[PDB]
Amino acid sequence: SQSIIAYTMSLGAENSVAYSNNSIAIPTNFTISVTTEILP
Amino acid sequence: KLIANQFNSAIGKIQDSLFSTPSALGKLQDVVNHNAQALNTLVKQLSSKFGAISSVLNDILSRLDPPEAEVQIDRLITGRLQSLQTYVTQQLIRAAEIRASANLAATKMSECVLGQSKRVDFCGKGYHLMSFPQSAPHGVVFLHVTYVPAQEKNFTTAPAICHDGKAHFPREGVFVSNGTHWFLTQRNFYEPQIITTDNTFVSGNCDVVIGIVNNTVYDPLQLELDSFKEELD
Amino acid sequence: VSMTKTSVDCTMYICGDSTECSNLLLQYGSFCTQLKRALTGIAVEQDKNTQEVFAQVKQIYKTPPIKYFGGFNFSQILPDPSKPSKRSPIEDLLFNKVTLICAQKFNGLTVLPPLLTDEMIAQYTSALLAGTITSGWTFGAGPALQIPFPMQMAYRFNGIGVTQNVLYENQKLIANQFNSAIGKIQDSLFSTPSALGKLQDVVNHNAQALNTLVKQLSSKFGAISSVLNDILSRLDPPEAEVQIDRLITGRLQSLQTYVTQQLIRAAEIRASANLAATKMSECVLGQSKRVDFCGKGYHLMSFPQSAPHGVVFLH
Amino acid sequence: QIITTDNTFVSGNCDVVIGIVNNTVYDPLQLELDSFKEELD
Ligand SMILES: *[C@@H]1O[C@H](CO)[C@@H](O[C@@H]2O[C@H](CO)[C@@H](O[C@@H]3O[C@H](CO)[C@@H](O)[C@H](O)[C@@H]3O)[C@H](O)[C@H]2NC(C)=O)[C@H](O)[C@H]1NC(C)=O
Ligand SMILES: *[C@@H]1O[C@H](CO)[C@@H](O[C@@H]2O[C@H](CO)[C@@H](O[C@@H]3O[C@H](CO)[C@@H](O)[C@H](O)[C@@H]3O)[C@H](O)[C@H]2NC(C)=O)[C@H](O)[C@H]1NC(C)=O
Ligand SMILES: *[C@@H]1O[C@H](CO)[C@@H](O[C@@H]2O[C@H](CO)[C@@H](O[C@@H]3O[C@H](CO)[C@@H](O)[C@H](O)[C@@H]3O)[C@H](O)[C@H]2NC(C)=O)[C@H](O)[C@H]1NC(C)=O
Ligand SMILES: *[C@@H]1O[C@H](CO)[C@@H](O[C@@H]2O[C@H](CO)[C@@H](O)[C@H](O)[C@H]2NC(C)=O)[C@H](O)[C@H]1NC(C)=O
Ligand SMILES: *[C@@H]1O[C@H](CO)[C@@H](O[C@@H]2O[C@H](CO)[C@@H](O)[C@H](O)[C@H]2NC(C)=O)[C@H](O)[C@H]1NC(C)=O
Ligand SMILES: *[C@@H]1O[C@H](CO)[C@@H](O[C@@H]2O[C@H](CO)[C@@H](O)[C@H](O)[C@H]2NC(C)=O)[C@H](O)[C@H]1NC(C)=O
Ligand SMILES: *[C@@H]1O[C@H](CO)[C@@H](O)[C@H](O)[C@H]1NC(C)=O
Ligand SMILES: *[C@@H]1O[C@H](CO)[C@@H](O)[C@H](O)[C@H]1NC(C)=O
Ligand SMILES: *[C@@H]1O[C@H](CO)[C@@H](O)[C@H](O)[C@H]1NC(C)=O
């Protein structure tokens, strides 16, 4: 069924970046993204 | 063609997002609601007595002689004047907030729509390409078109290439390796190119840079020379 | 970045545990409602301000277990796993310098906790530091792309008109100057009590506003007594109503003054938080060409640190 | 300015770019070579 629950909020997913002395990540593709900003 | 198709898809997504999400324009509805509250409260305060026998001036004047009516009227005047002072003060505070928002909107109009901005997250998420304004009630909506990197690949790198006692540095790019050969690529899009004397510049010897690797740097002029007089005679 | 979130029980401030006073208060209309909404709006705004300044990262990034970044020592800005709360040495210093029983001001005045705890803010700061250190400027614009730190710095040097070979030839000098400067930051903040004055001033202004609001309850405002219990104990309702209305007028004006000045301070804090969020995006998640926006000199990089009710940027 | 191999860069063939036009791109090195050993012997 359903109920109201309480929890400690999550801040985000974890991501361990593979940092190394001689390792680089380079985009092989791209996305064109359109977002919206609303101002009074 | 890919860029145009991604743009057109993103615009359709903007229409679907705004259409299907009632809360998308909440900031402007909140401004309208706050002004509606302020005025509904200001009018409702007229029904309060503030200690008077009645909230209606016509009933006070109908029932009492001027000398008593003046007391009841001064109680109502004090209450109504304080209600107006509260309304005006909160309108001035809201006006300051709206002015700050309008100044931000004008700055974004100039820097995002009339140009291209390098300010991170100022003109949307990603690297800014362009923006388009749209009018909205009591406000402006900006559609921010950005370039978002995707599908990154994992490469080996080096700060410099050592050729013949000299350290070669990229002019515009980063050195990468696919595990067998070294190439120079632009940083924001993988496009391997042969490492040459035109792509790189030379400064110093090979014993200074930490992490320098050994690779051939190609010089077109020498290769042509080595073919040009190959016969010799 | 944020302001203390307060809440006022209007009836209990003006007419604490007095039915006769409450009934007289009802004749002034919905003033308690307007004040309640104003303080609720401020309380919500302060959490919005904290969220906008610190919650700018989609994911919580972690540093490698091998904390070697070309010779650049970040141990004084990265979280210290040994101590509870997982704050950096600098963050511990910043929190130490600035200072459920409602023991004080129990006159209808309460303080609400922030939505994000100090630990959550420290976690956002840690994620931002890990992202900048391990992914450079690509972290802010999309997916985090690993880059060796000395190459990130060489790129940042190109960003200011200095070639990459200048950094690579002088990499040891650059790392040593950086480490010395960080040690100087710790010594400067530790030895200068006034370094964090802006945040202590915010705390002091909120403390003054509440101490003044409570102290005003002792004023008579023309009444025979400042205490409602003594007026009701001594006088019959018809005379008590006059004395009570004098006290109601004084207390309501005191609350209106408090709320108005909290709204003005809230606007100032909002402007500061908006500046802090802009600096977080342009200084920490990128490299800025705006002169003096991200520190004195040509900007290379910035590192956030959490502080009570605020943010400290190391430029 | 004259369109040369120093002013421009090369990426891909001529069948990809929409609106590409046909024009000579001048290469200084080849021209010098074509004069340098013109006599041949
Ligand atoms: C870079 O990413 C884009 C997507 O953002 C890639 O283009 C996409 O390629 C897939 C195929 O791998 C397309 O899916 C196919 O679409 C046709 C449409 O008729 C359909 O019949 C197929 O069954 C399949 O669904 C997809 O539509 C296409 N997207 C766009 C916007 O063109 C692109 O290939 C990637 N490039 C590289 C080098 O990875
Ligand atoms: C990065 O820098 C830190 C310090 O800036 C290095 O760790 C150690 O830090 C302490 C101070 O925090 C240094 O002084 C020590 O202080 C204690 C205080 O009780 C004292 O008992 C010790 O005798 C010492 O004076 C300590 O010297 C320093 N460690 C070293 C080896 O110098 C940290 O090691 C640095 N990281 C790298 C990778 O170099
Ligand atoms: C550019 O300026 C830097 C300083 O910001 C110069 O590096 C500094 O050079 C002096 C020597 O001229 C170093 O002093 C020496 O340090 C050793 C440490 O063991 C000490 O034993 C000596 O008695 C003397 O005190 C100083 O430490 C060093 N600073 C750093 C951060 O490396 C650099 O040489 C200058 N470059 C040019 C081209 O002028
Ligand atoms: C790294 O890239 C090079 C260049 O593309 C690869 O070598 C080439 O592979 C293609 C495969 O069709 C051949 O046609 C070329 O002749 C090769 N060139 C040379 C100079 O060998 C190489 O295999 C790649 N290595 C990895 C691990 O991806
Ligand atoms: C790059 O090539 C040079 C030679 O052109 C290497 O230098 C030699 O390194 C060996 C290492 O055992 C020494 O014994 C030689 O005396 C070196 N010769 C010279 C002229 O320096 C260099 O080590 C190579 N670098 C890498 C990373 O492989
Ligand atoms: C640029 O020149 C090329 C030839 O160097 C043209 O390609 C030819 O176009 C004709 C068009 O009728 C074809 O019949 C030939 O078979 C093509 N040859 C080759 C090798 O592609 C090209 O069309 C010219 N472009 C423009 C815009 O004039
Ligand atoms: C980078 O090089 C240093 C050289 O001392 C080494 O200690 C460190 O572990 C290396 N980093 C990685 C990820 O291998
Ligand atoms: C990149 O490649 C190395 C091996 O060359 C590997 O160890 C590393 O995990 C790779 N990165 C990722 C994100 O998998
Ligand atoms: C509530 O009281 C108990 C003791 O009766 C105490 O142990 C506990 O910590 C208290 N909780 C709070 C939130 O103060």
Residue numbers in the entry:
A (entry chain A): 689 to 728
B (entry chain A): 921 to 1153
C (entry chain C): 729 to 827, 849 to 1064
D (entry chain B): 1113 to 1153
The authors write:
The JN.1-sublineage KP.3.1.1 recently emerged as the globally prevalent SARS-CoV-2 variant, demonstrating increased infectivity and antibody escape. We investigate how mutations and a deletion in the KP.3.1.1 spike protein (S) affect hACE2 binding and antibody escape. To investigate the effects of N30 glycosylation introduced by S31Δ and two RBD mutations (F456L and Q493E) on the structure and function of the spike protein, we determined the cryo-EM structures of the recent SARS-CoV-2 variants KP.3.1.1 and JN.1.11 along with engineered variants JN.1.11 + S31Δ+Q493E, JN.1.11.1 + S31Δ, and JN.1.11 + S31Δ. The spike proteins exhibited three conformational states: “one RBD up,” “all RBD down,” and “flexible” (i.e., one or two RBDs disordered in the density maps due to flexibility).
JN.1.11 is JN.1 plus V1104L, and JN.1.11.1 is JN.1.11 plus F456L. Prior studies also indicated that the JN.1 spike protein exhibited either a “one RBD up” or “all RBD down” conformation. JN.1.11 showed an NTD structure similar to JN.1. Structural alignment of SARS-CoV-2 WT, JN.1, and JN.1.11 spike proteins with KP.3.1.1 showed that the NTD and RBD exhibited greater rootmean-square deviations (RMSDs) than S2. V1104L has little effect on any conformational changes; V1104 and L1104 are both surrounded by a conserved hydrophobic pocket formed by P1090, F1095, I1115, and T1120 in the same protomer. Using 3D variability analysis, we quantified the particle proportion for each conformational state and found that S31Δ did not affect the proportions of “one RBD up” and “all RBD down” particles by comparing the proportion of JN.1.11 and other spike proteins that have S31Δ. Besides, while F456L alone did not affect hACE2 binding (JN.1.11.1 has F456L compared to JN.1.11), Q493E alone substantially reduced binding affinity, which is also consistent with prior research and is likely due to the electrostatic repulsion between hACE2-E35 and RBD-E49317. Additionally, S31Δ did not markedly affect the thermostability of the spike protein compared to JN1.11, JN1.11.1, and engineered variants, as assessed by nano differential scanning fluorimetry, but retained a substantially increased melting temperature (Tm) over the SARS-CoV-2 wild type (WT) (Wuhan-Hu-1; GenBank: QHD43416.1) (Tm of 46° C vs. 32° C). In addition, other spike mutants with Q493E retain BD55-1205 binding, while F456L resulted in a binding affinity decrease where the only mutation of JN.1.11.1 is F456L compared to JN.1.11.
